[PDB]
C-alpha cells in the first residue's frame, strides 16, 4: 500500500500500483 510505504516520493496520487510497482518485500 502506497499509503503505508516505507520510502518517500511514492505517493503522488494515492496510486497503489505506482507504489508496489517498485516497492517489494
Ligand atoms: Zn512505495
Q: Where are the domains of the chain?
A: 1-25
Report CA-CA distances (Å) from 15 to 8, 25.
13, 18
Cell numbers found for residue 7: 520510502
Pull the grid cell for residue 18.
505506482
CA 23 / ligand 1 centre spacing (Å): 5
Measured CA to CA, the distance from residue 24 to residue 11 in angstroms comes to 15
C-alpha cell at 20: 508496489
Method: NMR
> Are the C-beta atoms of 4 and 14 separated by less than 8 Å?
no
C-alpha cell at 4: 503505508
Distance 20 CA to ligand 1 centre (A): 6
* SS3 letters across 1-25: CHHHCCCCCCCCCCCCHHHHCCCCC
Do residues 19 and 2 make contact, with C-beta atoms less than 8 angstroms apart? yes
CA of 15 to the centre of ligand 1 (A): 10
Q: How far is CA 20 from the centre of its chain?
A: 5
Amino acid at each position: 500500500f502506497v499509503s503505508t510505504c516505507y520510502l518517500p516520493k511514492c505517493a503522488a496520487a494515492a496510486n497503489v500500483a505506482a507504489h508496489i510497482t517498485h516497492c517489494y518485500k
